[PDB]
Amino acid sequence: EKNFVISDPRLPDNPIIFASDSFLELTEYSREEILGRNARFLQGPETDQATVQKIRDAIRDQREITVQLINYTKSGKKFWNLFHLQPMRDQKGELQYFIGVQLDGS
Ligand SMILES: Cc1cc2nc3c(=O)[nH]c(=O)nc-3n(C[C@H](O)[C@H](O)[C@H](O)COP(=O)(O)O)c2cc1C
């Protein structure tokens, strides 16, 4: 998993708290530009709203999902993101983070 971010769903709007070096390369953002923000900044005009709903539902249900959707780099370059979400639970079985892995399928 080279490109990924980890979010903290115990903080408001599930902000990114960690972004891998490859993710920065992929997306053209600096670490400072994106930590503390929700990963939906990757979306834009052509991102399929139905697929986003599929992600929203998986987050709500706290389950794994793999979808493919149009994302955008900082300059506004489109790419096909083969995206996999995974809930991560602590030692009490309580939701603790989400990991999001991106694969540029373009
Ligand atoms: C860890 C994590 C990684 C995510 N990575 C992406 C991503 O790479 N691309 C994307 O379009 N959305 C990604 N999302 C989803 C958005 O953050 C958001 O959950 C999605 O747009 C659905 O929720 P919303 O309707 O409130 O926008 C990620 C979410 C989480 C929690």
mmCIF file of C-alpha atoms and ligand atoms in Angstrom:
data_model
loop_
_atom_site.group_PDB
_atom_site.id
_atom_site.type_symbol
_atom_site.label_atom_id
_atom_site.label_comp_id
_atom_site.label_asym_id
_atom_site.label_seq_id
_atom_site.Cartn_x
_atom_site.Cartn_y
_atom_site.Cartn_z
ATOM 1 C CA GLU A 1 0.000 0.000 0.000
ATOM 2 C CA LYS A 2 1.965 2.930 -1.176
ATOM 3 C CA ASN A 3 -0.789 5.615 -1.368
ATOM 4 C CA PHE A 4 -2.914 5.932 1.729
ATOM 5 C CA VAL A 5 -4.332 8.232 4.365
ATOM 6 C CA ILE A 6 -5.632 7.384 7.802
ATOM 7 C CA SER A 7 -8.568 9.356 9.272
ATOM 8 C CA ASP A 8 -9.831 9.695 12.820
ATOM 9 C CA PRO A 9 -13.606 9.242 12.978
ATOM 10 C CA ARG A 10 -13.581 10.311 16.661
ATOM 11 C CA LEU A 11 -12.871 13.895 15.499
ATOM 12 C CA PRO A 12 -15.305 16.104 13.640
ATOM 13 C CA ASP A 13 -15.861 15.111 9.952
ATOM 14 C CA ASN A 14 -13.295 12.281 9.978
ATOM 15 C CA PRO A 15 -10.152 14.383 9.272
ATOM 16 C CA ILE A 16 -7.021 12.874 7.757
ATOM 17 C CA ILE A 17 -4.383 12.492 10.472
ATOM 18 C CA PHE A 18 -1.699 10.702 8.400
ATOM 19 C CA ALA A 19 -0.876 10.870 4.622
ATOM 20 C CA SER A 20 1.804 8.660 2.980
ATOM 21 C CA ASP A 21 4.585 10.154 0.909
ATOM 22 C CA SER A 22 3.248 8.480 -2.231
ATOM 23 C CA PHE A 23 -0.194 9.964 -1.577
ATOM 24 C CA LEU A 24 1.340 13.482 -1.680
ATOM 25 C CA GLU A 25 3.090 12.602 -4.947
ATOM 26 C CA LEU A 26 -0.121 11.215 -6.403
ATOM 27 C CA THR A 27 -2.277 14.139 -5.423
ATOM 28 C CA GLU A 28 0.249 17.043 -5.679
ATOM 29 C CA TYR A 29 -0.730 18.310 -2.143
ATOM 30 C CA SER A 30 1.765 18.985 0.640
ATOM 31 C CA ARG A 31 1.240 17.309 3.988
ATOM 32 C CA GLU A 32 0.312 20.688 5.524
ATOM 33 C CA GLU A 33 -2.337 21.291 2.894
ATOM 34 C CA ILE A 34 -4.336 18.234 3.810
ATOM 35 C CA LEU A 35 -3.898 17.021 7.401
ATOM 36 C CA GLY A 36 -6.963 17.895 9.510
ATOM 37 C CA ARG A 37 -9.179 17.823 6.379
ATOM 38 C CA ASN A 38 -11.724 15.315 5.120
ATOM 39 C CA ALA A 39 -10.494 13.367 2.066
ATOM 40 C CA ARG A 40 -13.515 14.529 -0.065
ATOM 41 C CA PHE A 41 -11.254 17.332 -1.425
ATOM 42 C CA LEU A 42 -10.140 14.642 -3.934
ATOM 43 C CA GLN A 43 -13.588 14.840 -5.524
ATOM 44 C CA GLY A 44 -14.852 17.121 -8.273
ATOM 45 C CA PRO A 45 -17.424 17.708 -11.048
ATOM 46 C CA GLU A 46 -17.082 14.314 -12.646
ATOM 47 C CA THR A 47 -16.970 12.199 -9.504
ATOM 48 C CA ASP A 48 -19.973 9.947 -9.577
ATOM 49 C CA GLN A 49 -22.303 10.988 -6.716
ATOM 50 C CA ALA A 50 -23.723 7.471 -6.499
ATOM 51 C CA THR A 51 -20.276 5.998 -5.793
ATOM 52 C CA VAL A 52 -19.618 8.640 -3.149
ATOM 53 C CA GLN A 53 -22.899 7.490 -1.546
ATOM 54 C CA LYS A 54 -21.528 3.970 -1.484
ATOM 55 C CA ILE A 55 -18.477 5.219 0.415
ATOM 56 C CA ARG A 56 -20.675 7.358 2.783
ATOM 57 C CA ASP A 57 -22.757 4.245 3.539
ATOM 58 C CA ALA A 58 -19.730 2.051 4.176
ATOM 59 C CA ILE A 59 -18.296 4.665 6.588
ATOM 60 C CA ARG A 60 -21.678 4.907 8.323
ATOM 61 C CA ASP A 61 -21.834 1.094 8.622
ATOM 62 C CA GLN A 62 -18.157 0.881 9.433
ATOM 63 C CA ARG A 63 -17.408 -1.757 6.796
ATOM 64 C CA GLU A 64 -14.815 -2.305 4.020
ATOM 65 C CA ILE A 65 -15.573 -1.108 0.484
ATOM 66 C CA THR A 66 -13.757 -1.011 -2.839
ATOM 67 C CA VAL A 67 -15.046 1.383 -5.494
ATOM 68 C CA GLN A 68 -13.658 3.131 -8.531
ATOM 69 C CA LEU A 69 -14.233 6.792 -8.935
ATOM 70 C CA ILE A 70 -12.900 9.976 -10.540
ATOM 71 C CA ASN A 71 -10.643 12.002 -8.268
ATOM 72 C CA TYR A 72 -8.652 15.176 -8.848
ATOM 73 C CA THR A 73 -5.090 16.273 -8.056
ATOM 74 C CA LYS A 74 -4.386 19.767 -6.624
ATOM 75 C CA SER A 75 -3.888 21.242 -10.116
ATOM 76 C CA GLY A 76 -7.149 19.646 -11.176
ATOM 77 C CA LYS A 77 -5.865 16.709 -13.127
ATOM 78 C CA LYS A 78 -8.478 13.877 -13.335
ATOM 79 C CA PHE A 79 -7.533 10.274 -12.426
ATOM 80 C CA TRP A 80 -9.414 7.009 -11.900
ATOM 81 C CA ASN A 81 -8.996 6.051 -8.277
ATOM 82 C CA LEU A 82 -9.392 2.388 -7.426
ATOM 83 C CA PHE A 83 -10.193 3.132 -3.817
ATOM 84 C CA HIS A 84 -10.347 0.737 -0.863
ATOM 85 C CA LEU A 85 -11.694 1.743 2.571
ATOM 86 C CA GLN A 86 -11.030 -0.273 5.685
ATOM 87 C CA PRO A 87 -12.292 0.329 9.236
ATOM 88 C CA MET A 88 -9.698 -0.175 11.954
ATOM 89 C CA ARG A 89 -10.875 -1.120 15.476
ATOM 90 C CA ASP A 90 -8.972 -0.836 18.773
ATOM 91 C CA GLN A 91 -8.361 -3.630 21.299
ATOM 92 C CA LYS A 92 -11.949 -3.161 22.737
ATOM 93 C CA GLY A 93 -13.477 -3.567 19.257
ATOM 94 C CA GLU A 94 -14.234 0.140 19.097
ATOM 95 C CA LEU A 95 -13.816 1.959 15.800
ATOM 96 C CA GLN A 96 -10.607 3.909 15.974
ATOM 97 C CA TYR A 97 -9.498 4.884 12.447
ATOM 98 C CA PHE A 98 -10.301 4.397 8.775
ATOM 99 C CA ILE A 99 -7.583 3.601 6.323
ATOM 100 C CA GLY A 100 -8.104 4.692 2.743
ATOM 101 C CA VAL A 101 -5.842 3.226 0.030
ATOM 102 C CA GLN A 102 -5.661 4.851 -3.446
ATOM 103 C CA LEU A 103 -4.519 3.221 -6.732
ATOM 104 C CA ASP A 104 -4.246 5.341 -9.846
ATOM 105 C CA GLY A 105 -5.856 3.048 -12.351
ATOM 106 C CA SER A 106 -5.219 5.537 -15.217
HETATM 107 C C1 LIG B 1 -9.569 7.166 5.318
HETATM 108 C C2 LIG B 1 -10.460 7.716 4.239
HETATM 109 C C3 LIG B 1 -9.877 7.824 3.002
HETATM 110 C C4 LIG B 1 -10.666 8.343 1.968
HETATM 111 N N1 LIG B 1 -10.101 8.479 0.725
HETATM 112 C C5 LIG B 1 -10.875 8.968 -0.312
HETATM 113 C C6 LIG B 1 -10.340 9.069 -1.597
HETATM 114 O O1 LIG B 1 -9.214 8.693 -1.855
HETATM 115 N N2 LIG B 1 -11.093 9.545 -2.637
HETATM 116 C C7 LIG B 1 -12.360 9.956 -2.418
HETATM 117 O O2 LIG B 1 -12.984 10.419 -3.353
HETATM 118 N N3 LIG B 1 -12.921 9.869 -1.183
HETATM 119 C C8 LIG B 1 -12.183 9.352 -0.114
HETATM 120 N N4 LIG B 1 -12.773 9.264 1.142
HETATM 121 C C9 LIG B 1 -14.215 9.596 1.347
HETATM 122 C C10 LIG B 1 -14.581 11.002 1.733
HETATM 123 O O3 LIG B 1 -13.716 11.380 2.789
HETATM 124 C C11 LIG B 1 -16.039 10.948 2.131
HETATM 125 O O4 LIG B 1 -16.234 9.973 3.155
HETATM 126 C C12 LIG B 1 -16.938 10.558 0.944
HETATM 127 O O5 LIG B 1 -16.939 11.677 0.093
HETATM 128 C C13 LIG B 1 -18.363 10.255 1.409
HETATM 129 O O6 LIG B 1 -18.793 11.121 2.460
HETATM 130 P P1 LIG B 1 -19.499 12.541 2.180
HETATM 131 O O7 LIG B 1 -20.838 12.384 1.486
HETATM 132 O O8 LIG B 1 -19.771 13.228 3.481
HETATM 133 O O9 LIG B 1 -18.625 13.312 1.223
HETATM 134 C C14 LIG B 1 -12.007 8.745 2.207
HETATM 135 C C15 LIG B 1 -12.586 8.613 3.446
HETATM 136 C C16 LIG B 1 -11.784 8.098 4.469
HETATM 137 C C17 LIG B 1 -12.401 7.984 5.828
#
